Design an enzyme around this catalytic site. Structure first.
Site, PDB file in Angstrom:
ATOM      1  N   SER A 115       3.751   2.176   8.469  1.00 62.15           N
ATOM      2  CA  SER A 115       3.376   1.235   7.397  1.00 62.15           C
ATOM      3  C   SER A 115       4.601   0.622   6.762  1.00 62.15           C
ATOM      4  O   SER A 115       5.554   1.335   6.474  1.00 62.15           O
ATOM      5  CB  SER A 115       2.617   1.973   6.288  1.00 62.15           C
ATOM      6  OG  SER A 115       1.267   2.218   6.635  1.00 62.15           O
ATOM      7  N   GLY A 116       4.570  -0.686   6.544  1.00 57.92           N
ATOM      8  CA  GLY A 116       5.698  -1.375   5.916  1.00 57.92           C
ATOM      9  C   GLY A 116       6.781  -1.807   6.879  1.00 57.92           C
ATOM     10  O   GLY A 116       7.622  -2.632   6.515  1.00 57.92           O
ATOM     11  N   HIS A 149       0.809  -1.228   0.000  1.00 54.55           N
ATOM     12  CA  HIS A 149       0.000   0.000   0.000  1.00 54.55           C
ATOM     13  C   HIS A 149       0.847   1.286   0.000  1.00 54.55           C
ATOM     14  O   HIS A 149       0.340   2.338  -0.401  1.00 54.55           O
ATOM     15  CB  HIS A 149      -1.069  -0.009   1.118  1.00 54.55           C
ATOM     16  CG  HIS A 149      -0.625   0.457   2.462  1.00 54.55           C
ATOM     17  ND1 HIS A 149      -0.352  -0.438   3.480  1.00 54.55           N
ATOM     18  CD2 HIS A 149      -0.478   1.716   2.938  1.00 54.55           C
ATOM     19  CE1 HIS A 149      -0.005   0.290   4.520  1.00 54.55           C
ATOM     20  NE2 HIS A 149      -0.069   1.596   4.239  1.00 54.55           N
ATOM     21  N   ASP A 197      -0.956  -7.257   1.630  1.00 51.60           N
ATOM     22  CA  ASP A 197      -0.233  -6.010   1.797  1.00 51.60           C
ATOM     23  C   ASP A 197       1.262  -6.232   2.036  1.00 51.60           C
ATOM     24  O   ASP A 197       1.767  -6.047   3.148  1.00 51.60           O
ATOM     25  CB  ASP A 197      -0.900  -5.161   2.890  1.00 51.60           C
ATOM     26  CG  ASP A 197      -0.478  -3.714   2.852  1.00 51.60           C
ATOM     27  OD1 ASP A 197       0.120  -3.292   1.830  1.00 51.60           O
ATOM     28  OD2 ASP A 197      -0.827  -2.974   3.797  1.00 51.60           O
TER      29      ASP A 197
HETATM   30  C1  3Z7 Z   1      -0.925   1.971   8.694  1.00 50.63           C
HETATM   31  O1  3Z7 Z   1      -1.906   2.322   9.668  1.00 50.63           O
HETATM   32  C2  3Z7 Z   1      -2.039   1.514  10.761  1.00 50.63           C
HETATM   33  C3  3Z7 Z   1      -1.391   0.308  10.936  1.00 50.63           C
HETATM   34  C4  3Z7 Z   1      -1.547  -0.370  12.129  1.00 50.63           C
HETATM   35 BR1  3Z7 Z   1      -0.671  -2.036  12.346  1.00 50.63          BR
HETATM   36  C5  3Z7 Z   1      -2.340   0.122  13.153  1.00 50.63           C
HETATM   37  C6  3Z7 Z   1      -3.004   1.324  12.969  1.00 50.63           C
HETATM   38  C7  3Z7 Z   1      -2.864   2.029  11.775  1.00 50.63           C
HETATM   39  O2  3Z7 Z   1      -3.483   3.225  11.610  1.00 50.63           O
END
Ligand code: 3Z7
Ligand code: CA
Lengths: 249, 55
Positions: A187-188, A41, A90
């Site tokens: 993220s990632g 993503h 993802d």
């Molecule tokens: C990428 O966004 C998120 C990822 C995780 Br794991 C927990 C809450 C979030 O907002």
């Protein structure tokens, strides 16, 4: 990361920082000297594929201390089953243009075997999540790398304890009391599990309903489902073009 | 054998024809003569933190 602590410099040496035009994009995990695993993503809105940089040995974003290593991302490999704008599958596998140099500050995280990950790692309760993401929901991102210890939940328990669907390519981890979680800018990044003196890659910061929202948990890509897919790609020759969509399974 | 407590292996476990079991290690590690333990063969093995290892 919400409600965690600063990762002491060099204690998360597999942490990757991904940049696009010098701006913070996402995190990632170094798994050997040329490969990084991140979230698919992270790349939904990329147009300048040639301005994607991975930084290893990073800790404090306000200062260059000499341990940082920057590399151009030569290839972004995403599974065929991933649909942009959605949450399932993802995962992204990134090939660096040149290997990073392993030092006290740059070390890969072990990508485990599928069987070992499913029958053993999947039962280690707590794991560490890290990144330079938001310190709060609707708040500023961190200047120093943050780390948080989160417990893993069985999907049945996550579905029952919660206020998108949670597929077999995901797992829940975290807390439902709104105090501790990963966030958007994490993220990632790695969800790393300790077992008998060694750390392994078990999850990727993927998604959640806001950050540290009461009655909600963090959702992570279940890396064990992609071990063979990742291994086959790492044994393959590079191809022209940055973005590559690869058949999954 | 491998499903139960990782077959006693520190890292990877393979089940064999019968009651046989072989432990294995990730690259940059070698299996000890105990047949279960993995020792680093490189300066920077995966999943180990040098500043903590040298402490
Ligand atoms: C990428 O966004 C998120 C990822 C995780 Br794991 C927990 C809450 C979030 O907002
Ligand atoms: Ca820095």
């Amino acid at each position: 990361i919400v409600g965690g602590k600063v990762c002491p410099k060099g204690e998360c040496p597999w942490q990757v920082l991904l940049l696009v035009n010098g701006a913070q994009l996402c995190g990632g995990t170094l798994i050997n000297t040329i490969w990084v695993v991140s979230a698919a993503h992270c790349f939904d809105k990329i147009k300048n594929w040639r301005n994607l940089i991975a930084v290893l040995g990073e800790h404090d974003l306000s200062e260059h201390d000499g341990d940082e290593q920057s590399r151009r991302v030569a290839q972004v490999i995403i599974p065929s089953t991933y649909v942009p704008g959605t949450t399932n599958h993802d995962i992204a596998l990134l090939r660096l243009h040149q290997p990073v140099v392993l030092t006290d500050h740059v070390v890969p995280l072990c990508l485990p075997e599928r069987t070992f990950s499913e029958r053993t790692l999947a039962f280690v309760r707590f794991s560490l999540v890290s990144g330079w993401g938001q310190l709060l929901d609707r708040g500023a991102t961190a200047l120093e790398l943050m780390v948080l210890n989160v417990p893993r939940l069985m999907t049945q328990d996550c579905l029952q304890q919660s206020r998108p669907n949670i597929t077999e390519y995901m797992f829940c981890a975290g807390y439902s009391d709104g105090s501790k979680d990963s966030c958007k800018g994490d993220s990632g990044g790695p969800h790393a599990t300790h077992y008998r003196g060694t750390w392994y890659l078990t999850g990727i910061v993927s998604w959640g309903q806001g950050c540290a929202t009461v009655g909600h948990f963090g959702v992570y890509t279940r890396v064990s489902q992609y071990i063979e897919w990742l291994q086959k790609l790492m044994r393959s020759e590079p191809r022209p073009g940055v973005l590559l969509r690869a058949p999954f399974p | 054998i491998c499903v139960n407590e990782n077959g006693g292996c520190e890292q990877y476990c393979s089940d064999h024809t019968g009651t046989k079991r072989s432990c294995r290690c990730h690259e940059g590690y070698s299996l000890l003569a105990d047949g279960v333990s993995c020792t680093p063969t490189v300066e920077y093995p995966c999943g180990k933190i040098p500043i903590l290892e040298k402490r």
